[PDB]
From a paper:
In both crystal forms, the R103 side chain of one protein molecule penetrates into a surface cleft next to S131 (or A131) of another protein molecule. It appeared likely that the R103 side chain occupied the putative substrate-binding groove and prevented the substrate from entering. We therefore produced and crystallized the double mutant [name]/[name] (DM) for complex formations. A comparison of the wild type, [name], and DM crystal structures suggests that these mutations did not significantly alter the overall protein fold (Cα root mean square deviation = 0.144–0.2 Å).
Specifically, [name] adheres to [name] surface and secretes a unique cutinase-like enzyme that degrades [name]. By hydrolyzing [name], the enzyme produces mono-(2-hydroxyethyl) terephthalic acid (MHET), TPA and bis-2(hydroxyethyl) TPA (BHET). The enzyme is named [name] hydrolase ([name]) for its [name] preference. [name] adopts the canonical ɑ/β-hydrolase fold, in which the strictly conserved catalytic triad S131-H208-D177, as predicted from sequence alignment with homologous enzymes that exhibit [name]-hydrolytic activity, is found on the protein surface.
Numbering used by the authors: 0 to 261
Write the structure that this text describes.
Amino acid sequence: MNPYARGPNPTAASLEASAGPFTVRSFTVSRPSGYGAGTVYYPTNAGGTVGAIAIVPGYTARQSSIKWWGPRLASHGFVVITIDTNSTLDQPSSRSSQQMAALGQVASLNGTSSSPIYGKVDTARMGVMGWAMGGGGSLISAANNPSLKAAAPQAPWDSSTNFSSVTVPTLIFACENDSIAPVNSSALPIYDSMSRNAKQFLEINGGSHSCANSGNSNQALIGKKGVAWMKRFMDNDTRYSTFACENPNSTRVSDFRTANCS
């Protein structure tokens, strides 16, 4: 009866694998509207319309830093747009505006008959992700747009840590040994500020600032968690509640916290 459920029942193995059940294709956005560039990843065989997620990099960075999420998420039934910002030196607020413009363009493309994603998106179900300043931008997006269904920033940074206005289910990936956005002054205070939402804090043991980026050695766990979080909250899919809410009880995790999760 959940009209948003897609794919086979999940297992730890299926979520830890490099690829999900659906086949993925991608394209470059010809005329980015409000951001620098973008790549759209989508499932070719999901079986119904799926939600959309927009992912932004950190300061100085480009799509390569976050690109692994595209196929990883899309293969589980999401349309994912990874973006380059107008400038590599844009700040979090600007990143947030750009992230939201990218979701808007995904909505446009869903209504464009020549697009490969024509009619593949449920525009009412969206999510936001991003690294560092792009993670802070994701949190700003969530605060300003509470109709967003899920947020999952990584190693976030904002000059302000008060995200008490965020009511969107938010999973914060953190990196233990982050020296750019130290956990104790960035990710953790951000997590602690959020009081009205389902939330989770997952710190990778021994991780540098780039611990959740393309090429990381914890793709099994990080990808399982990201996908589970998005499935649970973007699709209201309670088949993923244990995966989304559980403490992994893993040696790869140096700090785990969660609240209001079901």
